[PDB]
Every structure is written in C-alpha cells, then in structure tokens.
Amino acid sequence: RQKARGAATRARQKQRASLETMDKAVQRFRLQNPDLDSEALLTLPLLQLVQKLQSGELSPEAVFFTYLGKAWEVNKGTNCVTSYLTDCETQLSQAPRQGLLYGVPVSLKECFSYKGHDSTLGLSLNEGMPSESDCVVVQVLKLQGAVPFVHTNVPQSMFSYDCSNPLFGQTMNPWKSSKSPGGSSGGEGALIGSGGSPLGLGTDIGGSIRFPSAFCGICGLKPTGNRLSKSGLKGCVYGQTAVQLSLGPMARDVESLALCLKALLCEHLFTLDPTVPPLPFREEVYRSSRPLRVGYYETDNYTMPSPAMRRALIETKQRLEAAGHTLIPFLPNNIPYALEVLSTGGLFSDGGRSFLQNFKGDFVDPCLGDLILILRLPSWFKRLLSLLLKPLFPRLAAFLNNMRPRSAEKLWKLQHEIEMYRQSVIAQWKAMNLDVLLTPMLGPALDLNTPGRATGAVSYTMLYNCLDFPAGVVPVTTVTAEDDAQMELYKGYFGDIWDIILKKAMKNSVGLPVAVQCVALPWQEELCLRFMREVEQLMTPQKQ
Amino acid sequence: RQKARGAATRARQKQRASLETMDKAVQRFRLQNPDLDSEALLTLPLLQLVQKLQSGELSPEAVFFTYLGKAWEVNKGTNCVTSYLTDCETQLSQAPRQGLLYGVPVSLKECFSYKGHDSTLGLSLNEGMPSESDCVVVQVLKLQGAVPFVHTNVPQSMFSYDCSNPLFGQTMNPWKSSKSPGGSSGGEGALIGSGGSPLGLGTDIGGSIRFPSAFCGICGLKPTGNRLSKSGLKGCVYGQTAVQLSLGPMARDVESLALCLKALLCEHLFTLDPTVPPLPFREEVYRSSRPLRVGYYETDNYTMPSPAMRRALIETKQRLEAAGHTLIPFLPNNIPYALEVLSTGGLFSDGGRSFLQNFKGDFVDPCLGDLILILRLPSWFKRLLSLLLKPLFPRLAAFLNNMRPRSAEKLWKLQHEIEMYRQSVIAQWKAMNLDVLLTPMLGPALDLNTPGRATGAVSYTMLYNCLDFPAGVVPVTTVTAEDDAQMELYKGYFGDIWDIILKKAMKNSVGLPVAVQCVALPWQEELCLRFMREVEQLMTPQK
Ligand SMILES: *[C@](O)(CCCCCCc1ccccc1)c1nc(-c2ccccn2)co1
C-alpha cells in the first residue's frame, strides 16, 4: 500500500496548502475592506445577489471573498473542501459583465475537471494526475461570468451515498456531526447547506445529487441525462450506457436551480458539445402557474418510508390539493424488476470487473461497506449464494444474481428491456394524463458509514436514473420528536439486513431536514422546476 | 422450409390482392373523373402540390388517386410495393385541413408499423403477424394531414444495400432493370425515383436511406438518430445501442425533405414519444444564405471512388467555390478503425447470434451474399481465418475478427471508444472551423445481387452512422460514356474480393444518377438541409 499511502500524504498536503491559500486571500481582502457587511451578503438569496452584481451595488470581489471566508469557516466543521481552485481570482477579474451568472461563486464536485487540478475521486490511481483543461460545463460557467472556486469532497469512486475516501477523509453533515451529508455529491451538500456556496454542480447515477440535497436541507435537480454536457468529467467506469450519469445544480432555493440551468443551456454549451441537443431553457414553462395533474405515491413498496418521510409526502399532497392541483394515485409498474434486474444489471453488467480496476493497490474506504468484497466474488459463487438466500432474503438474492458478468448478447437483451420499461412507465403516465409526479425522498440523513450497508434505500431515487426522467428534491419539513420515536416501530417490507441497518441509521435525527421528490417526463426539466417551485412555495414560503 | 414456403405463398397472395384493390380504386376514380390532367399533377414539385391542396385548387381525392395510379403503374417494372395500406381512403376523408402535409400521399418503408399490416422485413417469422397500431411517426404524419398509402419492399432482414427477399422478391432500379435500387429503403427509392410517390420515409443504420436515394436519383436525409421517434418501428436486433438506427425522409427535392422534417418535429411527435428531444425545426437556419466553410474529401482512402463519383465531388466543390464558399480539405481521422472495429464491432458485438435468430427455418436471400454463412462460423474459426488472411487481405481479416462475440466488459470498452471517436472528429471539425462537410457518395447503382458481395463500399455512408452525424445525399450528375469506360482502370486500394466485385458491379451504368453526401454536426439537420439546398441549386437548377 506504499503508493496509496504516499498518495494520501500528498493529497492531504495539497488540501492543507489550499485552505491556507484561501485563508490568506480572505484576510487580505478583509484588511483592505474592513467596512463590508458580510452576514447580510451571505444571507441574500442568489437571485438578489445576482441583481446586485448586475447593478454594481455589490462588487464581484466582495461577493467572492465573503463566500471564500464562509467556505473556509464551514469547512472546519465539515471537511467538505478538497481544493481551492487557485486561478479563480483571475477569472474573477475577467468574468464577462453581461454573463447571466456574473460574479457568482460556484462550488464543483471533484469530478468536474478543472485545469491544473486532480480529480482523484478518492482513488490513489488518480492522485498526481492534474487535468489539462476545464470540462465543458466549467467553461460555460466561466463564459456566463461565474467564478468556480472550490472542489468539494466525494466518497471513494463516487459510487456511494456516503462521503468518505482515504485521501481527504470524511465529510460530515452540517446539521449533526454524526450524520452522513449524503453523496456522492456530499461535499456540495455540506458546503451549500452550511451557507458556504450559493450554487454548486453535482452528478447523479442512483441519487447522488438528491441524497445530499435531501440530507443537508437544500434543493437539487437531476436533469435528463443528455440535457447537459458530460464532456471532460472525470469518471471511473467507461462505456456503460444502460444507466447514464446526469449532472445538475444544487442550491439553497429552486429559483437558483432554474437560473443555473438557464445559464448553462446556452449557445456556448451547445457549440462546445455538439452531442447535447440544443434545447434552450423554456422560461414560460418554468413560470407557469396553471393547475397540475400530480401523480403521487406514499411508498414504493420496496423501502418502507420513515415516519418523517411519510408525513412529508402526505402534508405536501394535502397542501397541493388545497392549492387546486389534482392529486392522483400512481405507482410505476414493476419497481422490484427495475431496481434489481434493470438498474443493478445495467450498472454491473460486467460483474464489477471494470469498477474494481480502480481499487487495485488501494485502500477500500469503510463507507463502501462490503461492495468491493461482493463484486470480487466469482460469478458461480454469486449465483450459488443467490440461490441459498432467495427463500429468506429475496432482495439480497436478486442483487447478487444481477451483479454477475454476462455476454454482449445478454447486455443487448438488458438494454432492450430498459428501453421497453421506460416506454411502459411513459404509457402509464399518459393513461392517467399526469403532468408531474410527487414521491417520497429518502431521509432523514443516515448515520456515518451506514449508507454502504443500506443499499435497498436507493429505491426512491435510482428508479428515475433507470427511467432517465428529470427528478429533483425540495426540503419540506424537519424530523419531530414523534417522527423520531416512531422509528422504533419501523420493520421494513423485507426484514433483511438492509431494513435492519436503515432502522438504526435513521434514528437520532430530531431537527434534521426531510424532502420530497418531484419528477417529470424526459426533457421536461422546466416543468419539473415549476413543480418544485410550487412545493417550495407551499411548504416553505419564505424561501419564496 | 414448409412454414417458410407457406409464408411466401400467403405474402404473395396478399401482395397480389393489394395491387388488385389499388387498380380497382384507381379505375373507379377515373370513371368518375375523366377530365383530370394527371401528368401535370404528377410533375408538380411537392411544395406546389401542397399549396394547391391548401388552396382547394386540387382536391386531396384527385392527388391521392392520381399518385395511386402512378404507383401501380411503376410497380409493374420495379416490384417496389408490398402492400396497399387499405384504410387510407378513410384517412383521406379525415385528414386535418390545417395539417402541414394535408392531402399528401406518403410511401412507407415496410418497417414502419401500420395497424392491421405485417411488417415482415422479408422474414417468414414475421408473416401473419399484423401490427396492432401505427408507429408514432405514422400517427404524426396522419395528424399533419398526410395519407400514408403503401408499404414498400426491403431486402430480407433490412441489413443490406440491395433489395430482395424470399416473400415479395426483387425490387429493380427504375433507371435500368439489371441494377439494384439500393437499400434497405430500396422500394422507396424505386417508387419515388419513378414518380410514384412525392414523399417517403426510410431508415438508415449503414447507408439505407442514402444508397437508394443515390442509386435512384432522389434526395434523402439521415438525421441524428434521436431527432425523430423510432417508437413502434419493426426491427430485428434489439438492444444494440452502439450504432443507432435513424429514420428520415426521401423525396424528389430538398425542400420536400425540409417540409417533411418541419411537419414531423411538432408537438404531436414530442408528446407521443417523450424520449425524443423536443427540438422544433429551425427555419431560419434552413433558409440561411450565408457563406459556408465546407470541409471536403475526394476519397476516404478506403473505397476508391468510381470515375463518376470523383467527377461529381470535384465539380460540386468547384461550383461551391465559385459561389463564394470556402472549400477546406478535411478527412476524419482513423476511418479504417471506425469502420472495421467500431462500426462492425458495434453491429456484431454478439457475433451475429441475435441477428441469426431471424433466419432460423427461413430461406436466405441471395442478395445477402455469404453474410449469414460467415456469421454462423465459430468464434475460434473467425479468429483463425482472420490471422491467415491478414497479411494479404487485411480488410477482410479485420471485418472477420470484429464480427466475433464478446463479453459485456468488452462491449463497454467498445462503446467508450465510439464515444471518444465521435469527440475526436468533432475536435478536428472545430479545429478547422467547419460549418459542413462534402463527401463522395457511392455510385452509380451496382448490379443486382452484388451489394452483398461488396461490403467495403459502405465506407462512405457507415462512417456517419458510427459518428451519428446528420448526412444527406443530393443527385448532381449522370454517368457519361467516358466515366463508364474508365471503370476498366479501377483497381481499388486493397485489391481484395470487394474491390473486384465493385469494379464489375458499377459497369454498364451510362445515364445513371450520381450523388454527393452532405454532412453536419449532431442536431444540425437544418444546416445539413441548407447545404443540400445549395448543392441542388448549383448543380441542378430547375430542381
Ligand atoms: C450517485 O448517484 C451514486 C449514489 C449511490 C447509488 C448506489 C446504487 C447501487 C449500489 C449497489 C448495488 C447496486 C446499485 C453517483 N454515482 C456517480 C458515479 C459513480 C461512479 C462513476 C461515475 N459516477 C455519480 O453520482
């Protein structure tokens, strides 16, 4: 493990030096600007911040250094920042004045390649391998006048809804030190949730924008996978197209997400990556205030919702009905099949071999639980173990069988099944003439190092990665004493280790945020946001 | 083969009865409408036909029955029509008046599912299996007032640029009976090419819109794969996503292609198939008359062009330069790798096993050559044969090696290579600041039953299926006596069987049409059409 230890030493050194550089830059600004009101600046909603930047009422220098100082401070308690993006003080001076995001500091998940910086993903193999250029979405953010300023932490490999790796260590939830911030966009969730950044970018293949957004009490949107460019993003599995990765914004309110999307969906983006359909942001759809037909479910019958989750969903449904929306019971067909056969099979068609390459010679972070050990099992043993478990723990049996390697022939068969499945859910949707769908969202935040042992709980989010529908989350309530107490009566629908771990993990969560999830059809991000805006307005009206 | 023989008998009976129904309907209309000038109606460009339908100057009944009569007539010499779509006389009466295609008769490749009709693909297994509903693009066509009226022939399985199957037989080029119409959208090419339909829809995975459009002297466009809905289309390989199928229009002129795309890219389409990006047709791009930076190559260094092909490309380049456009030498990198490893590998990742299921218990049409025989070979033998051929016939060796079955792990590796390759060609393109690319297009038409034995010749077209860029073809010239005579001097770059067959196949083509290919970046169909429109105006005025 000599190489891996050396890598961790070098990465920790680089982190420490970055945070020093941040501190020195902040103190310099503060010496030259003693009269600035920082707390007022930091509490302005993004849309107001932008208008003040656009009017010259606030300087971009003031905004950037005030947020830099806040980011450095909140990092002390969260360990969310891995790198200060250095050059950002010269982008600050060169930011296009007419840019939609002029002067706005933006945080980036560590996978958004930035010239001269590693995108380690917590893997020793990627340390000391700095990017030669900014990824396309970074380029566009800069062309729109934004100032990307930090890389934020992720769990090792990014394939996890916790947030620890052997290079930079563990990110903590800003609400409670014992809780996971979620992830794999956890650093973003922790930073934005603490007030350290107004806007961030994450990525999502099974809930990685939505988990941190829910657990840290912020808003996030996972668009249709090819709505935004993935060109130049750092990944760790190559050529897996059955369940595609999506990138999208995270922020403190829904309007911020809409602004971000609007800024990104510009000619710069479409010319820098011709493979993205040139679909501009449709403001009129986003701004619509007509009644909606809203499908909803209280449970997916796969992961029993926590008391807080169930209350969150029911209250939101009640408030929407009171506001004049039509609430229609709706459940996508064959969720177990979709999660166990289509999603798991799509992610692990090769039995994990490609994924496991990344860990050769490296430490495996405890936050990944036993995933690496299981993936390393011979296919025949996965199959045999599957057969033994099936009668008692069919969920566990099904995940094991579907993580086996297979032929290109059988992958084709799976890819066709995914396609047909998507069309089957679209058919149900049209049959009930739905506009949008309201679902529960996992939480309250799980304890540290339990997401990796509660894999079944991805059911609420991973379904919409399999279907490739835009899906976002909005905070709507906080866990009450009653909600938390009632977790003692949680049994789960299967009573397997995943249900047992989740019961324990979600305890001790009084005061923690809880969200719902908002879904629309492919390419309907604007309608998704219109619905998220409605939920936010009804459940948390002062976010506006 | 008892089932297969019975299937061929029942399909031939159905075709015969269809053509009879058409004839009877045509004769009825003519009895009631003796004073109609048909020849003038038939020679109206589509856009004028549409305005007359829209103004009430011509009735949709007159238009439909005149074209039906013409379709029936030209089918005598081409065998392009497999089925009359029967209910179309009721769609004719129900066609929405405000529809962009109101009253326009439309021909459909047989794979476009139509309620109550087989989409056999020339395969016995699909005979007697009528569709329960219209595919989404048929639905949209109808909502825009169009009257789909015939299914047109395809080669067995559709994976071929000839056009014969054991059920309905061989489709012939309307220009010369000994020539292939191209394909796999060959019946469309033959029908539109002879004047029997003003507008048709084809599909394309390796050139299947572009070959028949070139060989029959018409215009066609293969859009970006997911620009139009494939929902409800009949296929024969399921779940192969490395090299995506694309569907698109074929017509007599470029403006017809633009109108079809405009009418298709409507709210009805986007609501019926939510998986398609809701990108409306950008008329301002299509109508743009600014100078273009036009990349071009005269050869892809893989398939030596015929004398007519080369002259077609050079004259088009020269006219474009005369018109003020900047012509910039450009060639996509690593074409052999793209064709041999990415395209062939993508199409046959499983070694052909999924494809071969379709032919179990069936006859194999001669127009498929030895493709089914080679796909049936054991993987180890494909490998050994590959090694033996490599020193003399490296093209043939590479295709063989890359038609072997592999693991999902290796397919992932291939899909990543495809993605990176696309990005490499886009980077070349941006480095030269190209707007569009001009390339040769295969032809003149090959002799019947030779496309199946000249697989290397798909190089010009298949490259942009691999890259998934919009690509269209426009006729620009005809083969001269000199062009044809010089085929004697054709050697090919490889001198393998495919070069030898192609030399023989392209002989005896004096008078036959020859096209060029127009390419743009993904999602830039309107720019592609703007460039096709320029080529057509410069090379063929009156069109
Ligand atoms: C997140 O969406 C990952 C959330 C965790 C979902 C785990 C799903 C699962 C676990 C075990 C068995 C079957 C299913 C995310 N991951 C990425 C990512 C990961 C790796 C490479 C690139 N991106 C991005 O966002």
Ligand SMILES: *[C@](O)(CCCCCCc1ccccc1)c1nc(-c2ccccn2)co1
């Ligand atoms: C046409 O594009 C097919 C053109 C012929 C290309 C052959 C390429 C090749 C042959 C041998 C080895 C390697 C490459 C077309 N085909 C379809 C189709 C076929 C089967 C199912 C569905 N669609 C559509 O268009």
Ligand SMILES: [Cl-]
């Ligand atoms: Cl797409």
